[model samples]
Target: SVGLIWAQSTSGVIGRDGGIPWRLPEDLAHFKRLTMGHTVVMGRRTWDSLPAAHRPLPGRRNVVVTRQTGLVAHGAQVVGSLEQALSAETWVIGGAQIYALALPLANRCEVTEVDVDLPPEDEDALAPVLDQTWAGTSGEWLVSRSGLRYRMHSYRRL
Candidate 1:
């Protein structure tokens, strides 16, 4: 029942430095619709990047997986391993490292493919594990209001 969700640019960038590389508001809404009321797993850095006001992501049950112990993790539950995080969860909302660790165990992936290349300052990249894993032949596509063409692909494991 485990799945992962994210958006990636043409350059395969999921983030820059510490945040999303794009300002696609529609994508953010898309994210909320898909993940709302579901349990999501993330890494420490992802937990760190969220604004204090939005730390727990509201309706979603946030679970952060990190090696660092004794972390407050805002309002989210903290776990020391993916084994702990995914044990009973249904979704993974990630930073790259968390995505990588959870990929093989995932049953599906909901991905937004954004067509843009990020700058060097945008250091964080989505995991290569995505390509090494799921086949996206079965998914949906949509064009965003921003003219930033993207597809919401619901991919199942091969």
Candidate 2:
């Protein structure tokens, strides 16, 4: 089960300055719930963007895709390509580059659609655009504790 997951603004903006631009506790909780106890794959930059305390992402196997063989990501396995990270069930929790590479191989995508429309100049990373080959189902919109509107959409390849 190859899966990709991310939270993005309506404009497809996922990051700004190497981190999420908004504070949304609910979205984080949703991420945890879905990926817990599963193997998660991410790019080097995405691994670095995680908080020090959660570097390996407690309760899950962390696989980081990087070209630099010398790169040391404590507690996570380093792979040279996304293909090497696939497992019986793998979740790609990514930076833009990793998501793009994994999208074609992914059978499922979990997207958190954020309500904010970030300015073009502020967009540092974007989510993969889902095409007609995938079918989706969205949940009712919900407000985060910090007051941001967001909803989850689960997509499965047709």
| Residue range 46-115, candidate 1, lDDT tens digits | 8888877888899988998878769887678999999897665478888888888888788888888786
Tens-digit per-residue lDDT, 1-158, candidate 2 = 78999999988889888888887888889899999999999999999999998888999999999999789899999999988888477899999999999998999999999999796464489889888999999999988778889999999999
Query: Cα deviation of 23 in candidate 1 (Å)?
Result: 1.0
Screening candidate 1 with a backbone cut-off below 3 angstroms (N, C-alpha, C), the clashing residue pairs are 16-122
Residue 151, model 2, lDDT: 95
Residues forming the 10-long window of minimal summed lDDT in candidate 1: 119-128
**What lDDT does each candidate get?**
0.78, 0.91
RMSD of each: 2.4, 1.2
Listed in order, each prediction's TM-score against the native is 0.87, 0.95
- Residue 128, candidate 1: Cα error in Å is 3.4
Off by over 4 Å in 2: none
**Lowest summed lDDT window (length 10), candidate 2:** 117-126
